[PDB]
Symmetry: C4
Subunit: 385 residues, 4 copies
């Protein structure tokens, strides 16, 4: 029975820890995959962790990592939430150096992109069998979310980008049914830059908060209905959500240029004019993480917000983060449960090792209260190398 | 279908070996988690061993163990009984440094407590999805059972402690349905001290024999009805159950102070006025283990009992032990099966190693006869380190 | 639906290979249990390999093997047929240094013996839960089949021995239903010696070919109805089946004392007056294996037989062997499939290693034809040690 | 419900990546089987990777490989597609040094050949239980496909060969149901040579594109109906598909002798008079791979074709490749999905190592457009040895 996306986000006060895989600590001896972007996505029965791997295990020579980010060995795989990804427990999803995934209430939809930079192809799979294809339309590194896609009333949506990771690029939203694209639309976003979008359904519509790797310190967003009729803009809060970024000053609803000329995948949940912002604690490195609730901060510009909940000390490494959802058909709740995951990146380029891999941690909405704390990776580098 | 807890503990005469994981022996080479408090809990279909892990494998540097007991890397996980807990056969349960779990006949309820000592929070998960949250009400290490919680007529119950592990602390019994706290009561237990309670259902009510880490060599207990109406006391048997403890002399129904100023998690099963006491054979170390049947020693003070069933020789290490239940809905029986598990702790602080982990063995009630013997851990220390 | 054992053994011409786990070759690097007696047993849906482990992995110091055969670390476990027994793939079954197991059509019945030699206790489990217990009645190493038990019309049977492995011992046949002994009978077998019995159903009755470790080179047997009414004797074929044994001269239906005062677990399939004798190729060592069809040789004394099919070359090591069956309820056949497994023992006492473990291979009945050959263990010794 | 193979091959324009196991790369540290011929086969619910192993793991001395190709340790096993084959995730299928498998909609049929060269026997298993047997009829290495068999209307078909690998051999087509050979036919193919066939169903009939190891650079084919009434020939295209082979010159519908005196397992898909030829890129080595679409080329002789899609660069090792099928019962399509898998061989005889093993990559039909690229094995040799 297809997943209805007609309810709204559950109201929340804080975030309770949901999972921690300690994959890097475990990989020190155990056969664990060296991964990146471990995004979580759920069905009507379970939540799994998808990730991308170079096809190498920690503490092995094949984790050398000097390899191009987009190699032909990069594959999309998944394993149950909270477990360390290893060949002994991970399911194979797709060959990909960029992907996204989601369940529509019936079967899983996975999107893996592979191929050369000048003509990559997104392979759509529905319940493990290829159902469609999408070719780069700008021949300049087709890429997608690196996090969960959003499904509503039996249709799922994703956002792909094609073009330079600097200046203007091309951006399209896709709507698929049973893994088949039934409609796509190019965004008319001059001066915007979308990458690695974290999307989620809310009252039958989708909202995506993404990464402006071109010239913005704030995060850009797109929200659209089931017919790809959309709207775009930026989070106006002076509580800049990208990394790097400048100290929290006055923002704008259009790309803040001051230091936002690069970035990190991230997310944000919208509630009225308010926004739950997930971000690193450092303005220069992917270190630490914290959840900030800036009411009237999605449409306004301030430096003021009401709540700050710590997740990773500034003293420890963090990395990509993304939103994932829990539907009422899984929860029994009468609303959509917002949750998020954080990638704790270890190794290069910040540490003196020959590899790069990340652990994951995740938290969910919740009405009751929580506590801020630090749940870092905890691995002692360097490894036996 | 919900687990009815209306029947009574089956009448027994001894304890038969149920399981032995040989985790440490296996971990010398295998990818086994370094664990603590491996408690067992069953559903209406299977039994699992839950445990807490620092997220490190045996024989790996990350097992350094100098780390604080309550680290953000501690996670609650579970695997099938008798199996060595590895990242390849364990399911992720919750992030926690203290926890409990039980099945109501429908889904698993897990309780993982994590966060800072002055504001730790217990996350409750029904079927893997956060269903409620509990905050430290004393801001001094909210902690729980470290063993199975007890369910009855669709409601599960647990005991939590907050406050000093020395003098008076606070104790609350919680009643939850579908992982949600519907009622809670704070025990008016002046001069009592409760920790790591081992609870079990019996004729529609719950009984917990716990650990008095403040000032008792004997074990305190609490039994309550489904409405949290309770009674409290101490096992009065001169066969003292805690460790450390004095030589078996004359007991009492209120904290025996001679030597009882510390402790170890344990259990005891009440039968009329008698008691089946599980305990270490040594009075100073967590070494050895034996079952003692003191008929009518739950209310009377003696040193005499009638049956002693050896489990682990004084020459071998033991540790935490807890009780776990088999419901008629799993057994087909017309009574509830009292069973117990013993943690065989190896390493620090008693052994010259850099780590500390434990193996498990479990036994079950039974009418037919048994035999005493010694089922120690069996690992040759130290390891490759 | 209970397994009906009313059909007879399927007629056969030879034996086709069914499986080979290569556990020892794989154990060189993999995490394989060091094991003994990997007997096979099937349900109405699958076949599993059961085995006993000291709880150590190959190539690990804990596989030291100088330990007493019956240690408190020996555990009964199973994994799918053909797979290497590892803690990552094996299911825990019971704590035991001696055991048997069989499925009745509904659930598995496992029997594990543990405890001291002067009072070992067999714990019977049905679907993982203890359903009965049997104590030693001679207080001298209670032991059982070390292979599959036989179930018929919803009742399972097994044979246990208690007493010396030299002279006269005591033997009993047990009948259980849902893991509970409903009837037992002590065999009045003066001058007989039964050990490690290989039993199987045939037309509603059980026939067991065992090991006479006291004073017989030929194998003794017992057959009984569902009410434990029995018959006993020895295979009279001059083609002696035990090991050690003398060269095939003239047998008798009463213990051949020439060279058979020790032994090895083996099996045999009776067809009318004929016999399919499985046995080692050497008369002094557990080396090589072969299947021999001596028609009119279960009741007669000769040296002549009509067929010899090679399984393991005299040049390679063999060991325990046992029968297992495949019921029509699993097969679709209108008869019971006779099959057998062979333990390929490597290490001590015949090799200069510090351990002892075995691989397994199995074969099944079959109308079509087969071929003789050699399916040896294949591991290179010694190991890294 | 039995797989109906009455529909035809789906029309296609290119091939989309389906999987990549990275087994060898992962095998540097992880416990991965050293394998060969990892052919893929699907049921009505999942797709699996079958493969032959010497019962050894990468980077372990037992991978020494100087062992005969046909050893008694070789076993046919299978794990899920895209997963590295390890003893922790692979299912045992059969003892075999030559094999094939396919699902008929109800259960899996596996065929594993074992035994000596002068009398090998093929064991057929339907749902894991032996259902038939086939003896060598020429006593000269009875061998089979090493890829998926084809099922249609409840009957599966395979092609086996017995006799020399040089001159004339004997070729037989077997029709089996529920794993029992209901009919067979020896091909009357003078001057033909069939080995390692890649068969597939289409409109109720089977077509196989095999390997001529005797005297052909082009591939021989056989197509038959469900009554084993067949036709034979060679692909006439001057785009020679075998390896070794000559530069694409002029083909013939009869063995192209020149340079065609050896070979490699391969496949091809026929569409009218056209062919989708998969082949290595090199003409002397098993390196590189590409898919070529030569319309009107199955019946014609040319050097011209319209499409070439790279899969593996000439600078990277390839190996065996074969075809596997999707059926409309697993896909929901109204046609049969043609797919293929390529074996990436690393080690001997081309590389300075002691072992030989292969990784796998797979692609499927697809109407949408794809991209040619290079998805090589990616391991860094030599290994720790
Ligand atoms: C520890 C290790 O293997 N590091 C090597 C490094 O020495 C070498 O310079 C580099 C270039 O290929 O590859 C890896 O980084
Ligand atoms: C063998 C080993 O790795 N032990 C180290 C030890 O040398 C060091 O003093 C301690 C302090 O962090 O950490 C670990 O215990
Ligand atoms: C390689 C190894 O550790 N072998 C030891 C051996 O040296 C020692 O004499 C014996 C005593 O228990 O134990 C093991 O056999
Ligand atoms: C690295 C290694 O151990 N290789 C050995 C090689 O030295 C030996 O000559 C050969 C003969 O069996 O076996 C293995 O290939
Ligand atoms: Ca930016
Ligand atoms: Ca105490
Ligand atoms: Ca004997
Ligand atoms: Ca050729």
């Amino acid at each position: 029975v297809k997943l209805a996306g007609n309810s709204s986000l559950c109201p929340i006060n804080g975030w309770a820890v949901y999972s921690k895989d300690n994959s890097i600590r475990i990989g020190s001896k155990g056969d664990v995959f060296v991964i990146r972007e471990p995004f979580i996505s759920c069905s009507h029965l379970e939540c799994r962790t998808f990730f991308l791997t170079q096809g190498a295990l920690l503490n092995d020579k094949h984790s050398n990592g000097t390899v191009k980010d987009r190699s032909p060995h990069r594959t999309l795989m998944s394993c149950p939430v909270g477990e360390a990804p290893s060949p002994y427990n991970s399911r194979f999803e797709s060959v990909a150096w960029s992907a996204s995934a989601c369940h529509d209430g019936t079967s899983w939809l996975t999107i893996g992109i592979s191929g050369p930079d000048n003509g990559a192809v997104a392979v759509l799979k529905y319940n493990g069998i290829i159902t469609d294809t999408i070719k780069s339309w700008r021949n300049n590194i087709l890429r997608t979310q690196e996090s969960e896609c959003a499904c509503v009333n039996g249709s799922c949506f994703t956002v792909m980008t094609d073009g330079p990771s600097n200046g203007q690029a091309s951006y399209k939203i896709f709507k698929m049914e049973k893994g088949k694209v039934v409609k796509s639309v190019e965004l008319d976003a001059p001066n915007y830059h979308y990458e690695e979008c974290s999307c989620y359904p809310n009252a039958g519509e989708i909202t995506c908060v993404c990464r402006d790797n071109w010239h913005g310190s704030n995060r850009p967003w797109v929200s659209f209905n089931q017919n790809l009729e959309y709207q775009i803009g930026y989070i106006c809060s002076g509580v800049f959500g990208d990394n790097p970024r400048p100290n929290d000053g006055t923002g704008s609803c259009g790309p803040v240029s001051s230091n936002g000329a690069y970035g990190v995948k991230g997310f944000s949940f919208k509630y009225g004019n308010g926004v739950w912002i997930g971000r690193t604690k450092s303005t220069n490195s992917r270190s630490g993480f914290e959840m900030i609730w800036d009411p009237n901060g999605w449409t306004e510009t301030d430096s003021s917000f009401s709540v700050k909940q710590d997740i990773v000390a500034i003293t420890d490494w963090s990395g990509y983060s993304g939103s994932f959802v829990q539907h009422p058909e899984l929860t029994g709740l009468d609303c959509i449960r917002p949750c998020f995951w954080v990638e704790l990146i270890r190794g290069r380029p910040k540490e003196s090792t020959i590899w790069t891999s990340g652990s994951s941690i995740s938290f969910c909405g919740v009405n009751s209260d929580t506590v801020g704390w630090s749940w870092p990776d905890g691995a002692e580098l360097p490894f036996t190398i």
